JSON list of C-alpha atoms and ligand atoms in Angstrom, two decimals:
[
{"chain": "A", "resi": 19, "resn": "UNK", "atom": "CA", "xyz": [0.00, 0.00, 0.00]},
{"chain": "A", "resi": 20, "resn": "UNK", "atom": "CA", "xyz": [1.18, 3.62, -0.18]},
{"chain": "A", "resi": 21, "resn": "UNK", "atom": "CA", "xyz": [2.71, 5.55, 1.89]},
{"chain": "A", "resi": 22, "resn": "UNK", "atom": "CA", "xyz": [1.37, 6.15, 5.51]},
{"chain": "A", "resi": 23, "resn": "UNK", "atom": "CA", "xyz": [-1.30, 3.65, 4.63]},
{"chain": "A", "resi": 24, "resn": "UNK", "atom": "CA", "xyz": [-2.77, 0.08, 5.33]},
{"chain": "A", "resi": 25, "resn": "UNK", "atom": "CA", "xyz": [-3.82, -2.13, 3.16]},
{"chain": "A", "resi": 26, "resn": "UNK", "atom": "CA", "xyz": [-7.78, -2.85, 2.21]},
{"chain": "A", "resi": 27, "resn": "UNK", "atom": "CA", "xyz": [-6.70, -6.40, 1.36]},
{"chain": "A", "resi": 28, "resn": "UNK", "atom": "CA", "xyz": [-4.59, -7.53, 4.34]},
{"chain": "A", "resi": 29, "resn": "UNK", "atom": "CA", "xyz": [-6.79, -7.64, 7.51]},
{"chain": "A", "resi": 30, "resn": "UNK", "atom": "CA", "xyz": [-7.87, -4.84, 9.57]},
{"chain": "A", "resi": 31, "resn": "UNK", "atom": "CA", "xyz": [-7.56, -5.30, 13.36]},
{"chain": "A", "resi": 32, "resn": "UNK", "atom": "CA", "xyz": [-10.47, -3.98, 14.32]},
{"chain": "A", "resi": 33, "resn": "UNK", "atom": "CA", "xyz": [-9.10, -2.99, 17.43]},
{"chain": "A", "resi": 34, "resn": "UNK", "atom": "CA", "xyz": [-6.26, -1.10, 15.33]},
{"chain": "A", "resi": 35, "resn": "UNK", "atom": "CA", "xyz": [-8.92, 1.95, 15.41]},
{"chain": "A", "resi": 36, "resn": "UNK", "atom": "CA", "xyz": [-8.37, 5.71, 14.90]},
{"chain": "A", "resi": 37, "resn": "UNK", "atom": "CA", "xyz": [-10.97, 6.86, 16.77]},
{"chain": "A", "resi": 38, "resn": "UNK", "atom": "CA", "xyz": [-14.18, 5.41, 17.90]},
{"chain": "A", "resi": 39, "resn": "UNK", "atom": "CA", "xyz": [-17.73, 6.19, 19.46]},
{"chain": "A", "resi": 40, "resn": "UNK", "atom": "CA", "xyz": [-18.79, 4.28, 22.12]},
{"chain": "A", "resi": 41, "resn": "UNK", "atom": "CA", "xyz": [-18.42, 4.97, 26.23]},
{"chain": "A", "resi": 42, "resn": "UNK", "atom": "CA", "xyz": [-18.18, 1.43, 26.89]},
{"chain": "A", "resi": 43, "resn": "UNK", "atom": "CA", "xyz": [-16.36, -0.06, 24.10]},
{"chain": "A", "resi": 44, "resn": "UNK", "atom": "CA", "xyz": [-13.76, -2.32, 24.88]},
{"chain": "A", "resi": 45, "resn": "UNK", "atom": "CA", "xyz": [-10.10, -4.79, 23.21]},
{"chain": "A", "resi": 46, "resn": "UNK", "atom": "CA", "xyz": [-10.61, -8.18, 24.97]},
{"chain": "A", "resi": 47, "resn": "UNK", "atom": "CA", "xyz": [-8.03, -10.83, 24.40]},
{"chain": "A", "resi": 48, "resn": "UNK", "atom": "CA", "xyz": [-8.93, -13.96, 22.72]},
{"chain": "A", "resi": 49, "resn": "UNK", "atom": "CA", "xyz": [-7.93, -17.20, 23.79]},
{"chain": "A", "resi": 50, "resn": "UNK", "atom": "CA", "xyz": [-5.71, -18.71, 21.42]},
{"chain": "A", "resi": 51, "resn": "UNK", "atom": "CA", "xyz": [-3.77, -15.19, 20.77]},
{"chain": "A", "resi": 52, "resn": "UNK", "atom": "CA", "xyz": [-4.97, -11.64, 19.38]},
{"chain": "A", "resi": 53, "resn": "UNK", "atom": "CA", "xyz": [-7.70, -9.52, 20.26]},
{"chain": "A", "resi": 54, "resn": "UNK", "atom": "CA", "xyz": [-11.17, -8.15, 19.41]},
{"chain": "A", "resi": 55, "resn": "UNK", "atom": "CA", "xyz": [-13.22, -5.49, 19.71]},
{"chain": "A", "resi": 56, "resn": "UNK", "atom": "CA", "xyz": [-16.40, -5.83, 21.80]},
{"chain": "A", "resi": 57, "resn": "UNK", "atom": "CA", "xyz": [-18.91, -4.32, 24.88]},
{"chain": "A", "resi": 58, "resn": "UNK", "atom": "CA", "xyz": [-20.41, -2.81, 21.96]},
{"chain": "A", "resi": 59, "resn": "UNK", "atom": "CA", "xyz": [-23.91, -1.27, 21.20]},
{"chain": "A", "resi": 60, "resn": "UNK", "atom": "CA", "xyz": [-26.61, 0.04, 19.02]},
{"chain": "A", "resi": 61, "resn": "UNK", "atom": "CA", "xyz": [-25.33, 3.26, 17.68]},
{"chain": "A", "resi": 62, "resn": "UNK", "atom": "CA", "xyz": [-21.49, 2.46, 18.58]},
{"chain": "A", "resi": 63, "resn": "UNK", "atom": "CA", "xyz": [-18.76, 2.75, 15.64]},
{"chain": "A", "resi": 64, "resn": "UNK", "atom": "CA", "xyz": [-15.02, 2.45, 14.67]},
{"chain": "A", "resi": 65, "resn": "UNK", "atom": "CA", "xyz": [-13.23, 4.07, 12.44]},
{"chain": "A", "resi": 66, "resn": "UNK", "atom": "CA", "xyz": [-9.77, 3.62, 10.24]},
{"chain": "A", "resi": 67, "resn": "UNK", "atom": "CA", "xyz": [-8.63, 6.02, 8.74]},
{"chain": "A", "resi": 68, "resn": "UNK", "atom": "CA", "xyz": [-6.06, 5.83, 5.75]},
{"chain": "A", "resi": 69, "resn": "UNK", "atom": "CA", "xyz": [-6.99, 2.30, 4.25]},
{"chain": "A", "resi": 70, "resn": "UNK", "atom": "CA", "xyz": [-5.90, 1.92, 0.38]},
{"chain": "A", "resi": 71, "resn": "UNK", "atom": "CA", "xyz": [-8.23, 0.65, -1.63]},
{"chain": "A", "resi": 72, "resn": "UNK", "atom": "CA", "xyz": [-6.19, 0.66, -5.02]},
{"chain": "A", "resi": 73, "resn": "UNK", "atom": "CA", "xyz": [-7.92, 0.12, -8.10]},
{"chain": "A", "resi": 74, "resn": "UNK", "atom": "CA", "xyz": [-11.12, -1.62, -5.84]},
{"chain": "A", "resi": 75, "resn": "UNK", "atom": "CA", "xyz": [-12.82, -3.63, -3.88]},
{"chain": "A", "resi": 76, "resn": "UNK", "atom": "CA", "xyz": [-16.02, -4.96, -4.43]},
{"chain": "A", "resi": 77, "resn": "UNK", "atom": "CA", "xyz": [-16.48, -7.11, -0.81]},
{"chain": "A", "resi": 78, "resn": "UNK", "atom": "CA", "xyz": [-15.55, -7.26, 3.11]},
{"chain": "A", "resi": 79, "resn": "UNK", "atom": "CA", "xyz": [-15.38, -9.78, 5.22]},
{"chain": "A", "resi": 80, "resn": "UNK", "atom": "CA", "xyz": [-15.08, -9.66, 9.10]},
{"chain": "A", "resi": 81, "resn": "UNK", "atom": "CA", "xyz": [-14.35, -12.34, 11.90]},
{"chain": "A", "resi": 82, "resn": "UNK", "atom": "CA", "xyz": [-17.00, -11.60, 14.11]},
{"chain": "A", "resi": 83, "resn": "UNK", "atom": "CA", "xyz": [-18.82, -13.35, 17.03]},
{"chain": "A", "resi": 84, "resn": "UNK", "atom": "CA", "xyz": [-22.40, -12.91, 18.54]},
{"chain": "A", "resi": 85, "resn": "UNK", "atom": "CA", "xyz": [-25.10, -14.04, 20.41]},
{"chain": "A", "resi": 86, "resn": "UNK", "atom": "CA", "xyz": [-28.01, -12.16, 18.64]},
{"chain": "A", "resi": 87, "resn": "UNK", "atom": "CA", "xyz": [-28.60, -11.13, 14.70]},
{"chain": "A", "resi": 88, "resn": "UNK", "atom": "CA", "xyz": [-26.96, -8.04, 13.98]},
{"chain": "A", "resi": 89, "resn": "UNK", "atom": "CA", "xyz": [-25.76, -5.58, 11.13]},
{"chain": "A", "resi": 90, "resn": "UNK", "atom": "CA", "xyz": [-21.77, -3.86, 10.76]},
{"chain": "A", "resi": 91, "resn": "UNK", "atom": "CA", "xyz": [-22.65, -1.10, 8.16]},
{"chain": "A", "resi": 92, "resn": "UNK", "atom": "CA", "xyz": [-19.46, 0.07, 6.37]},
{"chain": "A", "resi": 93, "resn": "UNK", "atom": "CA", "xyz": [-19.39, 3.44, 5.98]},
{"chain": "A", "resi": 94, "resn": "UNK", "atom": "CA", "xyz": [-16.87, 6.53, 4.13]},
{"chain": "A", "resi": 95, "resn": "UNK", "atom": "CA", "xyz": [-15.79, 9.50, 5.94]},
{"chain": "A", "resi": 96, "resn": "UNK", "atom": "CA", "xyz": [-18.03, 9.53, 9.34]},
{"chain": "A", "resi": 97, "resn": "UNK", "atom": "CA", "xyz": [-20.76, 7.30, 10.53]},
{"chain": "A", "resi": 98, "resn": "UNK", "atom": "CA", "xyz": [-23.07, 9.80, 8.35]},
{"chain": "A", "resi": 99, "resn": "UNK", "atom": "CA", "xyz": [-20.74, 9.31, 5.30]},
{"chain": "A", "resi": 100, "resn": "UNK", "atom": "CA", "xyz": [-21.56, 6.93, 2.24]},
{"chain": "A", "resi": 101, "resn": "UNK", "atom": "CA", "xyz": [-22.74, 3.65, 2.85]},
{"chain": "A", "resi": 102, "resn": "UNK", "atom": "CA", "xyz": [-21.06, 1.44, 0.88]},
{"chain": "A", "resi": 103, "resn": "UNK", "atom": "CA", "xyz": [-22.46, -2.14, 2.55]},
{"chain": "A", "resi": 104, "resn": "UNK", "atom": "CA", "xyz": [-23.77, -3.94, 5.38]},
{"chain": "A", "resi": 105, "resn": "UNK", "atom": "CA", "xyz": [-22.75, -6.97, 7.07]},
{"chain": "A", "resi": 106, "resn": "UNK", "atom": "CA", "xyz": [-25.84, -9.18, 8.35]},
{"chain": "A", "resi": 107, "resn": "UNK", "atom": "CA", "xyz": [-24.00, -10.85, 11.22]},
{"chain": "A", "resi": 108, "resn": "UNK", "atom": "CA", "xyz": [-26.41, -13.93, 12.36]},
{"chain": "A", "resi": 109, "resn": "UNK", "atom": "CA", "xyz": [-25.62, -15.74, 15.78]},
{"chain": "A", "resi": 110, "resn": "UNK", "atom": "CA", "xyz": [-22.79, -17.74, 16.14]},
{"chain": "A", "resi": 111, "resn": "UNK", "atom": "CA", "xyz": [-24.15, -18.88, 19.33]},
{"chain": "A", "resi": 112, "resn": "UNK", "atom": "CA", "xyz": [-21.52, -17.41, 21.55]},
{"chain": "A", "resi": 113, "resn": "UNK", "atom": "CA", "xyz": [-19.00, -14.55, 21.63]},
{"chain": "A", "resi": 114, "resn": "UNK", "atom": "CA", "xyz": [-16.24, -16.09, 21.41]},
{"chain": "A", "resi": 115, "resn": "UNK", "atom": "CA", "xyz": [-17.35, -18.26, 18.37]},
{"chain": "A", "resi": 116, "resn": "UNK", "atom": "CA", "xyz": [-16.07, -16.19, 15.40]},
{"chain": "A", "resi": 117, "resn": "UNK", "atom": "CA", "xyz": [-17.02, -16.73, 12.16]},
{"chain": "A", "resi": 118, "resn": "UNK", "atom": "CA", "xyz": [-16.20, -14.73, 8.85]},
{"chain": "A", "resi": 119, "resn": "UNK", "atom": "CA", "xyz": [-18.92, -13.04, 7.38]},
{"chain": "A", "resi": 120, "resn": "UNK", "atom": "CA", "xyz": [-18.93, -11.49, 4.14]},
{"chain": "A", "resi": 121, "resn": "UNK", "atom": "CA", "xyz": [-20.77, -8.75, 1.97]},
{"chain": "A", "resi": 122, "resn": "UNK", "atom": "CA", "xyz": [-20.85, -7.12, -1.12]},
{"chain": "A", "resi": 123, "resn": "UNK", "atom": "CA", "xyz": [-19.87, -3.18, -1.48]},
{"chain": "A", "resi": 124, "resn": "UNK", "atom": "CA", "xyz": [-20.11, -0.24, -4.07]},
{"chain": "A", "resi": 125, "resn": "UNK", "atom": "CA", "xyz": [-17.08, -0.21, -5.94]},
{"chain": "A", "resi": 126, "resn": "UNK", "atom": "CA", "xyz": [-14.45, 1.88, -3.59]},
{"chain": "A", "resi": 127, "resn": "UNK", "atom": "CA", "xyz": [-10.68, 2.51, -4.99]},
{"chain": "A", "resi": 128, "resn": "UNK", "atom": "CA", "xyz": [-7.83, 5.05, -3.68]},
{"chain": "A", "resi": 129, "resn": "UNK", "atom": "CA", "xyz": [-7.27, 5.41, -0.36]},
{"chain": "A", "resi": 130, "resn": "UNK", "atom": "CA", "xyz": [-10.51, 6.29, 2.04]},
{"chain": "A", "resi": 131, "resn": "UNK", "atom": "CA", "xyz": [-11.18, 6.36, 5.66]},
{"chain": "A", "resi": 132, "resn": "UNK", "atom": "CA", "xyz": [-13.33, 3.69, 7.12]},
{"chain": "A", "resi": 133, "resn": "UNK", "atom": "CA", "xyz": [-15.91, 3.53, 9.97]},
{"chain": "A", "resi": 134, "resn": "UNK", "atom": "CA", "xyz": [-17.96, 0.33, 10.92]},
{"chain": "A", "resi": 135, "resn": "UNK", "atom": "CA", "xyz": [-21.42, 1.41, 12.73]},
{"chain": "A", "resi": 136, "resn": "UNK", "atom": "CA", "xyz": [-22.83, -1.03, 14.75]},
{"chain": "A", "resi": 137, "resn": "UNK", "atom": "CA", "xyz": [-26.74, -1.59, 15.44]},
{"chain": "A", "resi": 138, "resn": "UNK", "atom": "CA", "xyz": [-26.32, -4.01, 18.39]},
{"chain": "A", "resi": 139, "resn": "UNK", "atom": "CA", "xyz": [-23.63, -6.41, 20.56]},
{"chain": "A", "resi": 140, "resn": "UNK", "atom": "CA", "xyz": [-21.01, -8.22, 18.56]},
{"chain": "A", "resi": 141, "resn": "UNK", "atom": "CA", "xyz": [-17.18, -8.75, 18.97]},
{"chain": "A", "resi": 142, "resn": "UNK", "atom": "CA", "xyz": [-15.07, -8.08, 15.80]},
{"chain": "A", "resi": 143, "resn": "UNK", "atom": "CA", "xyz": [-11.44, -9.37, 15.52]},
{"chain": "A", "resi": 144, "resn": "UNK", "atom": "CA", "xyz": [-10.63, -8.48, 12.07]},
{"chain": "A", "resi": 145, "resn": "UNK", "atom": "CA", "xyz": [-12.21, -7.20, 8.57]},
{"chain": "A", "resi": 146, "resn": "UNK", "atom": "CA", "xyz": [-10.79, -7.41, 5.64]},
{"chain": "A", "resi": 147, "resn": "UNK", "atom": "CA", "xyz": [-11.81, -5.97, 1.77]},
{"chain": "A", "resi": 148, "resn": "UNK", "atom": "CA", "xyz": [-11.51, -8.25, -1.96]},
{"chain": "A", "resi": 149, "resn": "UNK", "atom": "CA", "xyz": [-11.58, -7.61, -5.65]},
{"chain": "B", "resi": 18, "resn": "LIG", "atom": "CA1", "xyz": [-7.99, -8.62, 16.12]}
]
């Protein structure tokens, strides 16, 4: 990726965030080494700035664990910025069963900042983007 830049195609810890909104929001370590982001709620968010896109990606995929359905909507700019997908995260049945869940996105190229917005409780140890 350029320079002062990460990657859209080599995973994202999502506790490797900028700046976030969220009072209670939390990094919890995981088990068998790393960490993930989690204590989150409705209306919480994350965001990464400086990811490079290059000439596109077209999907996103992120490790994620829950005990309830849930959505990750990935988002340009600010929590109000562009939309360009949403992740349907169904229950894995615990948090600390992760599972990689994927979605499609508008075309996004060049290098953009990031925020995930999330609409309830889910821990997220990584996302990722494809062409
Ligand atoms: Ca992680």
């Amino acid at each position: 990726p350029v320079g002062g830049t990460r990657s859209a195609f080599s995973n994202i810890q999502a506790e490797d965030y900028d700046s976030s909104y969220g009072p209670n929001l939390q990094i919890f370590s995981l088990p068998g080494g790393g960490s993930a982001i989690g204590y989150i709620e409705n209306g919480y968010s994350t965001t990464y700035k400086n990811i490079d896109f290059g000439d596109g990606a077209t999907s996103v995929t992120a490790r994620v664990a829950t005990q309830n359905a849930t959505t990750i909507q990935v988002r340009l700019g600010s929590p109000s910025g562009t939309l360009l997908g949403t992740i349907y995260v169904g229950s894995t049945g615990s948090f600390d069963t992760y599972r990689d869940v994927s979605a499609t996105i508008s075309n996004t190229a060049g290098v953009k900042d990031i925020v995930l917005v999330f609409s309830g409780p889910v821990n997220v140890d990584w996302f990722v983007f494809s062409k």
